[PDB]
Amino acid sequence: GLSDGEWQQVLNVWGKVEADIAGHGQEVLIRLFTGHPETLEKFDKFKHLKTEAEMKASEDLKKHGTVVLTALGGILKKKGHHEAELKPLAQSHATKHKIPIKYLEFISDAIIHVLHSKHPGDFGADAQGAMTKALELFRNDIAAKYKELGFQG
Numbered sequence: 001g002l003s004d005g006e007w008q009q010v011l012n013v014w015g016k017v018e019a020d021i022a023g024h025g026q027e028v029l030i031r032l033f034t035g036h037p038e039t040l041e042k043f044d045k046f047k048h049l050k051t052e053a054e055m056k057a058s059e060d061l062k063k064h065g066t067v068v069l070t071a072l073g074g075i076l077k078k079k080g081h082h083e084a085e086l087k088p089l090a091q092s093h094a095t096k097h098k099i100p101i102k103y104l105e106f107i108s109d110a111i112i113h114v115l116h117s118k119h120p121g122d123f124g125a126d127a128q129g130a131m132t133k134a135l136e137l138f139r140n141d142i143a144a145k146y147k148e149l150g151f152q153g
């Protein structure tokens, strides 16, 4: 669905995320977890964390922050030819972590909140359009693999 024009857009904005990955990673997860509290319970690793504060204090959260965004960057760099790297993830997210497609919706809303918050004024209408689009693409493909595996429908 995306044009090069757009992918350029997508990879420029990713350059902001890369300057401080554990930084963007931490806030993504915190925003996910606070706005959507039910999501925290899918992690036996973070479930203990009631407060936000307590969350921001967590190096383990930060370290996950970095894994999550290191994996997406990888997909994103691939400009849609990502069957190779998304196959593994759709699998583990479906059958083992048992993460509903709607929680991937949420973190996608989260990546966008976080970029405005942290980049107030240099993440324009075009880049937001492009960022939205590659995150939907990521999502539509997991969705295809969830259907297959017959997980939630």
Ligand code: HEM
Pocket: 039, 040, 042, 043, 044, 045, 067, 068, 069, 071, 072, 088, 089, 092, 093, 097, 099, 103, 104, 107
């Ligand atoms: C932006 C999309 C996401 C990416 C790229 C991603 C990436 C990853 C990676 C690479 C791992 C470890 C490798 C594996 O176990 O497959 C993982 C583990 C996990 N994911 Fe995700 N994730 C994403 C979204 C989510 C969401 C939205 C949830 C649920 C609310 C979730 C739940 C989990 C859990 C519970 C683990 C296991 C961590 C542990 O126990 O060490 N993931 N994630």
